[PDB]
Amino acid sequence: AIENIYIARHGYRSNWLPKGPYPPPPTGIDNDVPLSEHGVEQAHELANYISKLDVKPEMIFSSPFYRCLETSKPTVEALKIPLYVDRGVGEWYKPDRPIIPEPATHEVMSKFFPSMISPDWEPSIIPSNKGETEEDIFERCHKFWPVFIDRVERKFPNVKTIMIVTHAATKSALGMNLLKFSSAKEPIDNKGTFIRNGSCAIDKFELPFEEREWKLTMNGNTSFLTNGEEMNWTFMNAFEAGSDADIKARRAAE
Numbered sequence: 001a002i003e004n005i006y007i008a009r010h011g012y013r014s015n016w017l018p019k020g021p022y023p024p025p026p027t028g029i030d031n032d033v034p035l036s037e038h039g040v041e042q043a044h045e046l047a048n049y050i051s052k053l054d055v056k057p058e059m060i061f062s063s064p065f066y067r068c069l070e071t072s073k074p075t076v077e078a079l080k081i082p083l084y085v086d087r088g089v090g091e092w093y094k095p096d097r098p099i100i101p102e103p104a105t106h107e108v109m110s111k112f113f114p115s116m117i118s119p120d121w122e123p124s125i126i127p128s129n130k131g132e133t134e135e136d137i138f139e140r141c142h143k144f145w146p147v148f149i150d151r152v153e154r155k156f157p158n159v160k161t162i163m164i165v166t167h168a169a170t171k172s173a174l175g176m177n178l179l180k181f182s183s184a185k186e187p188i189d190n191k192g193t194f195i196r197n198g199s200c201a202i203d204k205f206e207l208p209f210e211e212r213e214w215k216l217t218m219n220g221n222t223s224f225l226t227n228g229e230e231m232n233w234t235f236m237n238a239f240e241a242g243s244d245a246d247i248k249a250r251r252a253a254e
Helices: 037-051 066-079 106-110 134-155 168-178 244-253
Strands: 004-009 060-062 083-085 161-166 202-206 215-221
Touching: 004 168, 037 066, 037 202, 060 066, 066 083, 066 161, 134 168, 161 168, 168 202
Parallel strands: 004 161, 060 083, 060 161
Antiparallel strands: 004 202, 202 215
16 A cells, blocks of 8 residues: 655754754753754755645655754644654664653653654554664664554555655665665665655665665755755764764864
């Protein structure tokens, strides 16, 4: 039944501000930062773009992290579709990270997005609370797809098109798994073309799941954003995406 899958990254994070002021994570959870004002604007531009599509998403599955729910919100409001949280598309944290964050529960997070998140959706898979090597997150996403698609197609037989709102690392690991590559540290062709993971960038893939084949018809589209592509990242980068280290490197050199 599923034949269209969009995958977008959350918008501009508040810890990307050159000098702040930096808000605390609303949930108190480490790394659970909100969008900056600019990120919210991106999120609205994403919604407007999606609302003009011929084939719109019929449901959203978002990471449990605040920034993804916040990026999802304006699209949910534009399209009035259901949104579920699946921890299986949550953020990537390396094993040696000092803190390995664990996202808020439905009860906590819903206080922040009242009535936006449909309950009764268990995790398709739970990212290790001890972190993941590059290899680990890739395998996590590989295991994710069959469990996820089976649950969706079974519970929602008539849904053809869905959207996932997630993080740069999870987005490209997910996409490269759909395309059946053995890792995310490699191009998808001969030109050395990588999946593009700008903030609020959005991929589209077009069609027994495991046997199915997909084509990437949209690669990290950001043409609908006023300021285009910002903070692109791949697994070839050394830092966690959107981390303070990642952004410091960029500004030091620009």
